[PDB]
Design a protein around this ligand. Structure first.
Ligand SMILES: CCCCCCCC/C=C\CCCCCCCC(=O)O[C@@H](COC(=O)CCCCCCCCCCCCCCC)COP(=O)([O-])OCC[N+](C)(C)C
Ligand SMILES: CCCCCCCC/C=C\CCCCCCCC(=O)O[C@@H](COC(=O)CCCCCCCCCCCCCCC)COP(=O)([O-])OCC[N+](C)(C)C
Ligand SMILES: CCCCCCCC/C=C\CCCCCCCC(=O)O[C@@H](COC(=O)CCCCCCCCCCCCCCC)COP(=O)([O-])OCC[N+](C)(C)C
Ligand SMILES: CCCCCCCC/C=C\CCCCCCCC(=O)O[C@@H](COC(=O)CCCCCCCCCCCCCCC)COP(=O)([O-])OCC[N+](C)(C)C
Ligand SMILES: CCCCCCCC/C=C\CCCCCCCC(=O)O[C@@H](COC(=O)CCCCCCCCCCCCCCC)COP(=O)([O-])OCC[N+](C)(C)C
Ligand SMILES: CCCCCCCC/C=C\CCCCCCCC(=O)O[C@@H](COC(=O)CCCCCCCCCCCCCCC)COP(=O)([O-])OCC[N+](C)(C)C
Ligand SMILES: CCCCCCCC/C=C\CCCCCCCC(=O)O[C@@H](COC(=O)CCCCCCCCCCCCCCC)COP(=O)([O-])OCC[N+](C)(C)C
Ligand SMILES: CCCCCCCC/C=C\CCCCCCCC(=O)O[C@@H](COC(=O)CCCCCCCCCCCCCCC)COP(=O)([O-])OCC[N+](C)(C)C
Ligand SMILES: CCCCCCCC/C=C/CCCCCCCC(=O)OC[C@H](O)CO
Ligand SMILES: CCCCCCCC/C=C/CCCCCCCC(=O)OC[C@H](O)CO
Ligand SMILES: CCCCCCCC/C=C\CCCCCCCC(=O)OC[C@H](O)CO
Ligand SMILES: CCCCCCCC/C=C\CCCCCCCC(=O)OC[C@H](O)CO
Ligand SMILES: CCCCCCCCCCCCCCCC(=O)O
Ligand SMILES: CCCCCCCCCCCCCCCC(=O)O
Ligand SMILES: CCCCCCCCCCCCCCCC(=O)O
Ligand SMILES: CCCCCCCCCCCCCCCC(=O)O
Lengths: 176, 137, 139, 137, 142, 176, 176, 176
């Protein structure tokens, strides 16, 4: 099933990257009641907050991420969105390795490194989610951008598993 | 208020439950990865089973032997111990502050776990039939 | 308020205890069924299924774990059920012992005497069953 | 008052502890007896290890296979579950009605378990030396 | 006011001295289990690394792949089991105490902020495990 | 024990079906204080509630199940009592399969089917009980109708086990 | 070591029986503050309570005992000291079997039955202790009679295990 | 690694002994508020307490350990500091055995003895710490003397493990 395995890997890599990039770009992470500058229903993201109703509707303001070493570090890490961006970067590199595999079949480690990138991307994604939620804590709901991030994590982990299976079966088949 | 069907989840916030599920997947995948590229049977399915059983503080048919497998296993064990103790402790808090304000627990505020249980048994029987038919043809 | 011999059951309602017993039987039977009729393989006979389930509920672990997907689903939901139920027992017992309906006393033998009687009764029953099995298998 | 060295025993009365020890012996002996006169390695020392591990909810290397062994094991499992839960629940009670009259527990109110631990390690080393010398001559 | 939850607030039920002594007890138990299992020349699976794994799993109540078979090994194992049971019960009980009574009665669900430290240690461990696996691979492949 | 196994299976199938059908029919599930019209002691089943002391002793009236979407679904499921009825249906089909197995000795799966039906009946029975209890409490006692349901569950599970044993023994002897 | 095993068995049987009989006879189970007929320090047993000081010192009465099915049964069982006496009886029969073993070496089961009697005696002893303590609950200390009972339990169990080991080794040796 | 093993053992033996001896000698176990004569910040060891700011800065005085039998025993044990001293003694004997092992190559047990001494030193060390902590608390901070004790414990245990490995390897190579 190597053809189908590679198909799943490529499609999944693209899906994970697309979902994560959209999530990092779009601004529907959180539905709360803040202000775009009275408090009204808003819809914040990683960078901008926007009004969902009333006169200033459609108006978005850069999130004042900033207004205790631990609080400072959390606020810094959440302000720069280090971890969502790092997960996007790693998904990009994983996709590059998956693409490069076919054009260079001599070396095996290419697809293995794809798998490792995807797994690492998932881990960064988790750290991002935790940091984001924790930083918010310092009524509400989660939007579709948040769930795009979550689905990116799941798909990334699946694609990592499939990639490692491709590498394993290549070495198992060739070695014996 | 009358207890809700899934009220047994109340001691931990929804985000904790969601992150438990993600951590579970991440642990299972890393255990699988470190085990297959290590000098010295943790496939992905067995990795998922090991991790599930570890979180439920139940049996393991197999434990990791490598240093990397044991690091993964050790941190997952520690996480499990903290999270389960936190569940029990916070449930004790909710029930003690409600008694301060027979108080035996009623079937109604654990009914959700029974529904999930019987749903799982139904699903298990369905999967058994599917796998059987697949292996037949 | 005299504790009462079976007062150790008080944290959970009588209906929860009876449904625990029914769930136990249902789990054991489904684990047996999904482990056997699969003709690919045919150690999870009915007696071993009951023993696996009992040990899972008591959090005593196992000598055997399910290997199939169906067996593992059954085992997994039974593990989750067990965790919630036992935590619920401990938490509610903590509630009753903290708030009387202010000092706290050590539990006395009277508060757990029922569990001792069930234990010694079980040991007596086990010895009787051993004799019966011996006489049966020796003829 | 300053906590006493063996204050970790306080949640259960002295009579409960003493009867736990007696129940432990009785269970181990009956498990040994039903296992040696049964159609179908539980000698007396393995019985005493199985029982100890069961009470500490620390699993086992061997489980009974006979119906009589499994009855004994089952009631000892049930007893263990109730008694351990009772210990934890009553300890939570004693610590809550104190906080209602340093948050963290101090080394002083678990010092006895450390002493028992190090005593056991010393005893273990002594027994190892004795057994070694005995097997030498 | 209510102290916002700290990372590592999951350690709060037990004093810092208890945690450090738990770590020392862990090392001492592992080393004595190794010692009483080995120098007995009658037999010589409880090397030092396996001793550490047995002890860790006992403390986390995750059981074992191997149990001691001698009397000395079983004494060591037994006292470590008892210690574990008291300490973990103490942790749960004291955490319940802290969550019930505020000492700067509605009671709220634990938030991710109350346990974020344990998640960070977990993901740190997964990262570390992957690094160690790479290092082992490079070592054993040359 | 082949003949004896089949005898146990048949007798048990009939017993389970009869007990469950009686339980679903009769009206002694619950003993509680109410009115079948001051409120007197009564007894309720799944459908009728009837006073057992007073002027209106022996009078009966349809329960008003419908005097919160979860509450609505519970009320619906408990009003139809779909689960006790489904348990009776499955016991009927299991009994029919046990009867048929005596004919089509060629096809083993018939008896296996019996087994599965019985097991499934047990599961539906337990759901029934939970729903019933969950809806009621949302003093009292349980009558003999309730315990007929409970004993039906136990017997159904035993007969399921025995049926599956018969099928296993068929496919083992055949291999020999 | 069969000679030494039999020596231990006989000595232990006698020790257990003596300790248990003394315990059931003597009156130093409990030190409390009751009355032999003002409250003073006393020393009760299974049957009589006595004054430990003052004018009426050395004067003993009979424990009332009898002065709620569960409470009734506990009070009845504790009043008659059924279980301590039963443990004495079983230790007596175990001793008889141990003695009879040597005079009849043809039959093996004699020593096995000795072992079983001793094990059963220990179990009865436990039930007695529990009943006694529980009945008292319905400041104080335990006397040397109590501890004689406890030591009887321990010795009885150790003699039972040695007797069963004698039987096992006889059947193992002879059979092979 | 034989030469390297012995080098680690010797260096570690010396390091553990030196650290523990310094710790028992120096006076920076605890930082707390008190008087070496209003109370100023100070630092205490096992014996002397000394002020580190004020008029009497640099002054020292013998601790009054003795300003409840368990309390008395704790006070006694912490006053003599028998356990830190015993830890130093055992480390000394372990080091002496390690030195001697280089001579009497014939007798293996010498190095095994070293191992055991080191392990035992570790245990006494831990008891020391517990006793110390238990007695003190019956704000503050721990100085570098305390941490020297802690590091001594760790190194002692590591050297014990290595020594036992050396002995094991001797008795394995000999068998080969
Ligand atoms: C087994 C291996 C486990 C490995 C574990 C690896 C080592 C530990 C990793 C986590 C350190 C977290 C940390 O210092 O948090 C700070 C807050 O920090 C934040 O709020 C940071 C938010 C971003 C998370 C990354 C607080 O740090 P502190 O002031 O020291 O308290
Ligand atoms: C709860 C969730 C349960 C999820 C379902 C559990 C079964 C899936 C694993 C079984 C499986 O497919 O293994 C196969 C690989 O095939 C794969 O690559 C499977 C895809 C990886 C799934 C990773 C989860 C994220 C073969 O490997 P094996 O499982 O060792 O056999
Ligand atoms: C409840 C607690 C304990 C009771 C458990 C004791 C009985 C154990 C099973 C008996 C059994 O195997 O007999 C036969 C069927 O046996 C049955 O059909 C009976 C099982 C009914 C299901 C239990 C639900 C109701 C319990 C109320 C089958 O014999 P077997 O094929 O040999 O089965 C394996 C047994 N072996 C491991 C000894 C080989
Ligand atoms: C799995 C194996 C289980 C083995 C189970 C074995 C059987 C255990 C039975 C225990 C019954 C206790 C009992 O009825 O106690 C009464 C009080 O009773 C006393 O106070 C009695 C004191 C003497 C104890 C004997 C109260 O009885 P109740 O009112 O029914 O409550
Ligand atoms: C802690 C104690 C642990 C050691 C006890 C078990 C020793 C077993 C033993 O010596 O081996 C022999 C029995 O020898 C016997 O007869 C032992 C008799 C002691 C039984 C203890 C009774 C209960 C505790 C007071 C052989 O039996 P084994 O169990 O095959 O070893
Ligand atoms: C087989 C495995 C187990 C093997 C054996 C394990 C059992 C070991 C025995 C424990 C000794 C501790 C001890 O003596 O406690 C003393 C204090 O103790 C101290 O203050 C310091 C003593 C440290 C040395 C501990 C030994 C290592 C006090 O002891 P106590 O006189 O009983 O005081 C009454 C207690 N009370 C304060 C709660 C009222
Ligand atoms: C702390 C947590 C985790 C750290 C554990 C990782 C190291 C595992 C042991 C390493 C080891 O065996 O190396 C050698 C000695 O090794 C030593 O002497 C080191 C052990 C020191 C004792 C630890 C106390 C302080 C920890 C701070 C011996 O090699 P080996 O004879 O092969 O030993 C069995 C290893 N095997 C199972 C891989 C074969
Ligand atoms: C791996 C396999 C395991 C998988 C397992 C999944 C198995 C399915 C779980 C069943 C969920 C039942 C359900 O939706 O509950 C409904 C009622 O439910 C009833 O009134 C009971 C009806 C019988 C359900 C029996 C299912 C089998 C109501 O629930 P809700 O609409 O979600 O209400 C919102 C939340 N609330 C309840 C707190 C208010
Ligand atoms: C044999 C292989 C074993 C390897 C696997 C073992 C993993 C088990 C333990 C993990 C927790 C360890 C980290 C504990 C967290 C420390 C946090 C800390 O020190 O916090 C400082 C404090 O918060 C200042 O304010
Ligand atoms: C497969 C082999 C398994 C066999 C061994 C399994 C043992 C596990 C369970 C034991 C508890 C059973 C007895 C539960 C106690 C019931 C008490 C009761 O019903 O009390 C009535 C109430 O007190 C009225 O007021
Ligand atoms: C390899 C292993 C195979 C895996 C084997 C499967 C068993 C998994 C176990 C238990 C989790 C199931 C219980 C959790 C059920 C989720 C539903 C829930 O909690 O519902 C809440 C509701 O959404 C209100 O908002
Ligand atoms: C199977 C081979 C045997 C297994 C090896 C045995 C290990 C036992 C382990 C833990 C229990 C012992 C620890 C408990 C000791 C009690 C301490 C105590 O008595 O202190 C209170 C004091 O009496 C003031 O009142
Ligand atoms: C091994 C780890 C897996 C453990 C499985 C535990 C089940 C997790 C369920 C989480 C569902 C999330 C829904 C939150 C509930 C709510 O907010 O109402
Ligand atoms: C998985 C099996 C675990 C054992 C469960 C124990 C069952 C206890 C007895 C159940 C019957 C009803 C008991 C409650 C009666 C009451 O006091 O109201
Ligand atoms: C397997 C069961 C054995 C478990 C071992 C637990 C240790 C029991 C210790 C009991 C000692 C009795 C002293 C009571 C304490 C007191 O009253 O001060
Ligand atoms: C057997 C090992 C179990 C794991 C134990 C975890 C150790 C936690 C870290 C110990 C160092 C001190 C931490 C407490 C610091 C504080 O917050 O005061």
């Amino acid at each position: 099933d190597r053809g189908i395995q590679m198909l799943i890997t490529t499609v999944g890599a693209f899906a994970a990257f697309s979902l994560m990039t959209i999530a990092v770009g779009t601004d529907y992470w959180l539905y709360s009641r803040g202000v775009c500058r009275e408090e009204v229903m808003t819809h914040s993201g990683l960078w901008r907050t926007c009004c969902l109703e009333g006169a200033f509707r459609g108006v978005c303001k850069k999130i004042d991420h900033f207004p205790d070493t631990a609080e400072y570090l959390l606020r810094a890490v959440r302000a720069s969105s280090v971890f969502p961006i790092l997960s996007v970067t790693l998904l990009f590199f994983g996709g590059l390795c998956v693409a490069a595999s076919e054009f260079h079949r001599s070396r095996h480690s290419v697809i293995l490194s794809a798998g490792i990138f995807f797994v690492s991307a998932g881990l960064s994604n988790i750290i991002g989610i935790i940091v984001y939620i924790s930083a918010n804590a310092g009524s509400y709901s989660y939007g579709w951008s948040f769930y795009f991030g979550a689905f990116s994590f799941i798909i990334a982990e699946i694609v990592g598993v499939v990639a490692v299976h491709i590498y394993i079966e290549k070495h198992q088949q060739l070695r014996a | 208020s009358k207890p809700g069907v899934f009220s047994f989840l109340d001691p931990l916030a929804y985000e904790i439950w969601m992150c438990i599920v993600f951590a579970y997947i991440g642990v299972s995948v890393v255990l699988f990865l470190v085990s297959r590229f290590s000098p010295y049977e943790f496939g992905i399915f067995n990795s998922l089973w090991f991790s599930l059983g570890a979180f439920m503080q139940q049996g393991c048919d197999i434990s990791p032997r490598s240093l990397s497998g044991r690091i993964v296993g050790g941190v997952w064990w520690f996480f499990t111990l903290i999270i389960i103790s936190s569940y029990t402790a916070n449930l004790a808090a909710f029930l003690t502050v409600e008694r301060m304000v027979t108080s035996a627990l009623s079937l109604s505020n654990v009914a959700g776990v029974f529904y999930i249980l019987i749903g799982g048994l139904g699903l298990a029987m369905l999967v058994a039939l599917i796998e059987f038919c697949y292996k037949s043809r």
